[PDB]
Write an enzyme that holds these catalytic residues in place. Sequence first.
Site, short mmCIF file in Angstrom:
data_model
loop_
_atom_site.label_atom_id
_atom_site.label_comp_id
_atom_site.label_asym_id
_atom_site.label_seq_id
_atom_site.Cartn_x
_atom_site.Cartn_y
_atom_site.Cartn_z
N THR A 14 0.82 -1.21 0.00
CA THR A 14 0.00 0.00 0.00
C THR A 14 0.85 1.26 0.00
O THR A 14 1.65 1.48 0.90
CB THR A 14 -0.95 -0.02 1.20
N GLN A 15 0.66 2.09 -1.00
CA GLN A 15 1.33 3.38 -1.07
C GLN A 15 0.44 4.48 -0.42
O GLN A 15 0.96 5.46 0.12
CB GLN A 15 1.69 3.72 -2.53
N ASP B 247 -5.35 -3.91 4.58
CA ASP B 247 -4.06 -4.53 4.93
C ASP B 247 -4.15 -5.38 6.22
O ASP B 247 -3.48 -6.40 6.35
CB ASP B 247 -2.96 -3.46 5.02
#
Lengths: 214, 203, 204, 196, 197, 116, 199, 199, 223, 213
Positions: A1-2, A59
Amino acid sequence: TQNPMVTGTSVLGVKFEGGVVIAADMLGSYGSLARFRNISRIMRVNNSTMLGASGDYADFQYLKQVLGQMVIDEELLGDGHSYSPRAIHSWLTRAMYSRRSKMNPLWNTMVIGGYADGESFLGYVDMLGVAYEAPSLATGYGAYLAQPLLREVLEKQPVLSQTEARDLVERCMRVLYYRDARSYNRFQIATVTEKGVEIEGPLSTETNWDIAHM
Amino acid sequence: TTTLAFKFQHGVIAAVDSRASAGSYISALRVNKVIEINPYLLGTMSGCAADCQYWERLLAKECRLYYLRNGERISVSAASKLLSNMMCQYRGMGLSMGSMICGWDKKGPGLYYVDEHGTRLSGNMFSTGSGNTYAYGVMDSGYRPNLSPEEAYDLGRRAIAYATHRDSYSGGVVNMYHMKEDGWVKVESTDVSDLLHQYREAN
Amino acid sequence: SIMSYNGGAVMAMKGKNCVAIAADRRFGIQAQMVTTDFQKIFPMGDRLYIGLAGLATDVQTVAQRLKFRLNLYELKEGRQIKPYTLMSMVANLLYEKRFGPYYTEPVIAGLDPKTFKPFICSLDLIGCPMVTDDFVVSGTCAEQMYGMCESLWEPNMDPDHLFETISQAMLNAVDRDAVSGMGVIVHIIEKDKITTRTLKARMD
Amino acid sequence: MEYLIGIQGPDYVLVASDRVAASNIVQMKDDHDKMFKMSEKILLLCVGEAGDTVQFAEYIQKNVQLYKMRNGYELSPTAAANFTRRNLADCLRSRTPYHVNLLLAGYDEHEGPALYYMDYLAALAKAPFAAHGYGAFLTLSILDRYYTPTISRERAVELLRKCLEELQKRFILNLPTFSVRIIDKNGIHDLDNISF
Amino acid sequence: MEYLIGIQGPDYVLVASDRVAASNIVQMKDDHDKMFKMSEKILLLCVGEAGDTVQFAEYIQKNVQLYKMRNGYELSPTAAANFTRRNLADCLRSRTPYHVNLLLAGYDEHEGPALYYMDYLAALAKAPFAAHGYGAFLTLSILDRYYTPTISRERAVELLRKCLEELQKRFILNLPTFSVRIIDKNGIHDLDNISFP
Amino acid sequence: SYDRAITVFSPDGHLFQVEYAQEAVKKGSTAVGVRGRDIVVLGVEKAKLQDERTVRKICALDDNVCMAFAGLTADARIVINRARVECQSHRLTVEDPVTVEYITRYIASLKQRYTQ
Amino acid sequence: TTIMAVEFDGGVVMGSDSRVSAGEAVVNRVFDKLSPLHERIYCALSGSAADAQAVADMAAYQLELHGIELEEPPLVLAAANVVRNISYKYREDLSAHLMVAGWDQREGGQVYGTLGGMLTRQPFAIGGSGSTFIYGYVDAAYKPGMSPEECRRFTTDAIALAMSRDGSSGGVIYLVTITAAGVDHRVILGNELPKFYDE
Amino acid sequence: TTIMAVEFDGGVVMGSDSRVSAGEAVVNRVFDKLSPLHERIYCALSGSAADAQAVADMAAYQLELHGIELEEPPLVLAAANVVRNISYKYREDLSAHLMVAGWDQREGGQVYGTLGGMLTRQPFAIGGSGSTFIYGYVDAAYKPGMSPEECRRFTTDAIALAMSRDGSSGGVIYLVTITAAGVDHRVILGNELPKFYDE
Amino acid sequence: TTIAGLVFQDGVILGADTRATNDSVVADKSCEKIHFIAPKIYCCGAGVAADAEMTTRMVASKMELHALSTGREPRVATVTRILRQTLFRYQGHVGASLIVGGVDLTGPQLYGVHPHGSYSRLPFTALGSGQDAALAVLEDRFQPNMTLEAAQGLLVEAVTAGILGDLGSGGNVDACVITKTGAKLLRTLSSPTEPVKRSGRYHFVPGTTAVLTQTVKPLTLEL
Amino acid sequence: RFSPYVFNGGTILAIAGEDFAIVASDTRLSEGFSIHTRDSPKCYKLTDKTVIGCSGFHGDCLTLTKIIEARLKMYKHSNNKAMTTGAIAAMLSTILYSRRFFPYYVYNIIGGLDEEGKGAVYSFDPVGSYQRDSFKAGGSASAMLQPLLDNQVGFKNMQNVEHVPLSLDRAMRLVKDVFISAAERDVYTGDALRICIVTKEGIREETVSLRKD
Ligand SMILES: *[B]([O])([O])[C]([C]C1=[C]OC2=[C][C]=[C][C]=C12)[N]C(=O)[C]1[C][C]2[C][C][C]1O2
Ligand SMILES: *[B]([O])([O])[C]([C]C1=[C]OC2=[C][C]=[C][C]=C12)[N]C(=O)[C]1[C][C]2[C][C][C]1O2
Ligand SMILES: *[B]([O])([O])[C]([C]C1=[C]OC2=[C][C]=[C][C]=C12)[N]C(=O)[C]1[C][C]2[C][C][C]1O2
Ligand code: NA
Ligand code: NA
Ligand code: NA
Ligand code: NA
Ligand code: NA
Ligand code: NA
Ligand code: NA
């Protein structure tokens, strides 16, 4: 995840005589929008371990799948060995560090609570692989509001009872509801003891608004 | 850093300062900026400390492998070429390493300059590092190919001491070597500020 | 950084009925040493000195503009300035340029012209004053000086004890700073006299 | 990119400067003069950005000449150096900052010979010797090595020649000729140019 | 920043190059050679970025020497110029592009003398005369003015000297000495260096 | 990829494929080499309708090294071109030219690799 | 912030949440965002706190002197133009939206929006970060002819609904009812808020 | 876009608007954003059209082969996981939110959100650019135990309310009712939309 | 910095820590952050130290002029206005975060003034880098109409939570109790960190420093 | 954008004596202007005659520490002997250099005994440059502590002073004083001082209190 999407705020945790207690609200925010006000950010890992997560919910759900399957795999062997809270904490440090080092982190900060062989376990792991143990933990904005109250009580009385720890955690959730704009008045309290892992909820704090007349 | 080397009648002089800096902080007052590859092969170092130490030690391992394989020492041209190719392989990667490979082979005294760009020049005088311009001024003014060993040691120690006075990223001690036909000798490890005080007292 | 363009170190230290003020002597532009005798400590009275580190041009402008205001003050008032008043005067001077400041962090050291009690202080680039009862430091080696000062400083040092403490705190601090040094100058300020000494220091 | 050098002796100040006026890759002039006479015993050597150098040097020069006309005596080298620093420092935080690096060499009746170094920020330093430009990186250590405070003018010119020879050998820029002048109790004296 | 020059006559190619190896504001070498022998009758003069020039020139040289060993004869100046172009053009859109500007001077038994200009983009041009570097801006008009196709080697060296004098006069960079070589039916001949006091 | 082990040990400790390759050498034209004081000589045994140049068994590897062979001529051509590439690759990596022993060592290791 | 104003026959109802937040930090949880501009004129503050308070103060000062020179209480339209002109003159340097509502003997209860220096009279208006989540609610729940009590109820339900969805809104709800009779200030505490679906 | 799904006893109702827009340009004014993943499983498409269509197609293909190997129609949880896995694995390269709803013999009518690769079962869910303006409306109007007709009415009112406030939503409303009996597709035309306050 | 304020039964209590840091390095261990405005009006400062120093100094000066002219004791709302309007004109460039506490003819009042010119009247508030630690202690145990001793205890606890929890805070707790009969300035009301002593035997024998030059200038001629 | 690093603080120091080596550190772990824990010592026992001090980004400290432990075991199994202090130092330089383009954000100081039983200190930068020292300071307060060590242990800037060797007793008091001074001026140094003493007998540990603010 950015870029995290639906995120969860502070996760608390404090060791007591005979176990650990963790707390986390049931909110998934999409920026400022309280998009999901009824999601659990706590997970029972095994009979000795429990986990709460701040950060991206997607996440956390992925980690919950990977962790849950590891526990199923171990239980298929039935060989008298099982992951200690400390080994789950250790695995999670490696897992977070590895993802950080590939420049694709799992966007979370977690609190692992455990009870094994008569000892209380409380450990922190962040998205960079920063891990450690402490008598109390507070992730996110709770590191600024809740941790000073957890530490203030633990200074006067280093060893609390299960009831003493519980009242302190409930007082922290109330302060967090008042001062954290990304919180919600719906939370869970999970406890780990010799008996196992118990998750209680949905809970609410009794608010007071008498200062509106001062 | 200030490193210098020059060929003369009696071989090759090689001198370095000893300062390491983390920005404006002096992280080390005395580092060894010379690698002794074998009794007939030296390497001066400037630039990024870790790059210098790793690549010059990798050149040393390759020189050692050459001796085991051929029962003979590597030439100064081949050793400087090996390092130059290591730098070419990593061009654009941000390595920082200036070095002078100084030795004595079947072709007499050898002195080569090698860069992190892959530049490789043979010559009889070079100077590298942030203080190289100050070392060139002194070294060029007092140079004669027919300098005696003691006259050469004075020129080397002076070019480095004078560079350390003007360059804030140079200081500590002068480590000087003299490369003779029968191998190098470490001449001295002298405090550069004591040398400058001595020069001043003679005025 | 603007403060590291020229570099330099300044420090003041309080003793028993005496004060000390010290500075390095380098004038350099980035890595090039230009001068080894640059003045950074300026007398503002018989027992009052100002130490200025930072950008060389502003060290000179602040000292000159401060001397201007001080001369007008002692002429109007018909008395020598008190150390605390010189601090307020520097604060006003520096804060007038709050949004385009002078790149200097002063250190003041003196004895009261009437009470003779030691005074030491420092100001940031925009004139915030800080008075202490031990030491003040300013320069590109402030961490190095804080370590030396915190370890070596003692409460009621005699002039000679103070001289050794400030000398060793400066020498050892500036010898871990690439852009400070080229000598150290120390002033010990007593009721009866001013002792000025230049130290045998590293020249690299 | 341009070169200035000054060597102060016991009763004189020796100064030199390159003679190249360049534009891009071309030397447009080989006989250019970078020195400015302020008084009978003061020279201001000026280098830097194209417009700034002559504009700044000439303004100071005319105001130094105005002082002489208004009072019947000239400013001392110290007073001229400080007046130059005041103007350069006042322009520093203004709309019009001048990018000039300079040297002021003078001789005073009471104080004797003086050499002042000033950078474009307007830091002012008194120096026994000094140099400006990339050339100073190659020549400052030559002066550190050979300069002594009692250096005679004859020896100063050989020390200067050593510096200028170093530029011919190591400096990547052409710089073939140099203006050379010396100031003492009898004013500013033109010496022969150093040529290669 | 470095200088290359070639003047092709009726039965020869005259070439020159500066002898400076420089780093930052310092002339590190005054006797540096920028020419590379490919064959008995071919020179490759190479200039550009620090690592690239010798890496590229040497690779081409060894592959030209490999051709001679494998076949018993050498590549013609045209075939060598085109082989050099092919390698430089193949690296152009790759991870490793070489920033080199070069001149290939040669003599072929059948085609006669040849001068090729190549820029770092790998464009290849046959020229009666050519120059590389900032110096070419000051010297190309001198060659336009005085060059004629029948220029003798004696006259070619005078013309080369006229170009090198212009650099001493107007170019801001030092460049005091120049390597000079000429190629004809008898191979590569070293001439005296052009030097200025 | 074809990954069959071609040259293997036989019960007596022999590498039959290598011994069979030596039989092909035994059938080749006699090649003789003599090392003198200032000279080295190679001589090889020898169709009128044939162009002699296209079939010479004495090849140059570099300016200072040359060789002769006996056996399968197509195999020889492969060994020769690899030795030739190696001589230039040696000049490119270390500058100095190849010694007769260095290039012999290269050819010998190439031959050994093709037996394992 | 969630601010709201409703016109009725004989006056207006104005409401606001009470949260002041610097990012994720609630700096003040009981802030009253309803400020009097005159005896029967109020404004609802949203956006930059410093700008909103500055505009409100200058408008109150301008309107006080206006009311004295005119010997009458200012019209709500005059208050609306006073705020609007300030917000428009300085639209590039100000970042606040002041909703202006109140009562007049001339036009009675009126609500005005001054968003970015514009001026519009509305039957009801909503503003603030929280208004985004209640556009559909106010469009579905608004009915013409509501009584003062029905307006208060509507404002309370709409603001409570936004407070629950918006991280930047919360606390208590402040209500103000302006009529010819005077002004009624009222507070609905964070525990006594109307409940809806919240999962 | 405004997409919505509601669970009831025995099935689900799904609705969408019909506007496809490239900035200020309406490229398609009658697009049906309700796509079948299986006989009794549908998804509601929002975000990037190319991504949404790509994911829907791969999910339908994966679920078809899954259904055939299992000798049964896939569970709605299997469909929601299939969608969630694609959306999560490619979260940095896909910009679509596919709401998955339908019917099962094991769990019946269920609604699932997959936003950004997460998975959550909801009594009702709203998505798209238009959902922002109806959060308060759905919180005020949702009641537990609604009938199939009451769910359709709720979805229609909520989507019509968003279509009127959102520039990126408009056209007709598409409804789909999935039960054990089968699927009922229905269209509420842009002229026959429920009316609310619109000034 | 951790600065806090609290309104109790008979007045207000202002609290502050005593550390000044220059980017992760503690410059001052004992600075005064509680500033005088008027005899019954005090102000805690946080933010840019020079801006807090000069803005408090300026309003104390304007308040002396205001009180001299009016002949009356100054109001807390006047210092809030003056501060607000000065800070607003500078658009946040004057980085003063202030806690204004005081007693006037209308009773005890407490205000938070921000660098941009916004303010709020509150029963309790905290500012500075350690504001959340102080605010957690205040939210946890504040009750209206506290006794002086109960409010002082809560204030010391709130500033202490910030001292220990915040890296940018430290030293001692200073407090100021303002009532109708004036203000009691409790400089070092508490020291959470007890004297950290050591075996600091660092003495240099006279002569260990090598001196090159010495000049003695006497002043006994002037005396 | 995502930054893979964070500064967690901490100060380390090592002194080599004639027959001993001290490796000391504070126990504070920080992030931003907040404290993660007050009980995070930075000394790691590697062998019976070698300890390492690690400071910087804690995710890298944990990782690099576990890598060193695995590598010591791998070496003991291949060579049938423990790694010497020098061998650990040379190997550590290569592990740090393996990450030259994504460095480990760790300041490492090794302290132990060489093969002659004498004290050995080895200090590194994040990318692997190193040398042997008699004493060294690392971490946030290194610039504060180092000039004192230069003066008191190296005897620099002192004229007419006896160059008496460093005794364990003298070194212990000096480590205690410098960490008290560092905690007074560095916000990232505090809570406690863990001291590790290596001798032929083995490794002793002491813990001394430091300022909590
Ligand atoms: B010099 O170029 O300033 C110097 C070279 C240096 C320093 O330490 C060593 C050790 C071994 C070989 C060379 C060497 N560099 C520095 O001072 C810096 C310290 C380190 C980080 C930047 C650079 O390398
Ligand atoms: B709202 O749009 O979130 C809100 C308006 C508000 C809150 O508190 C006040 C005080 C005075 C006038 C308006 C007002 N904005 C804020 O709370 C923010 C906090 C601070 C930083 C931006 C704005 O001011
Ligand atoms: B909605 O979120 O505004 C909408 C969804 C949409 C529109 O058309 C289709 C077709 C297939 C699946 C989904 C869908 N999005 C758009 O209209 C956007 C315009 C264009 C760029 C992103 C997307 O397609
Ligand atoms: Na130096
Ligand atoms: Na300072
Ligand atoms: Na220094
Ligand atoms: Na809210
Ligand atoms: Na629409
Ligand atoms: Na500390
Ligand atoms: Na603290």
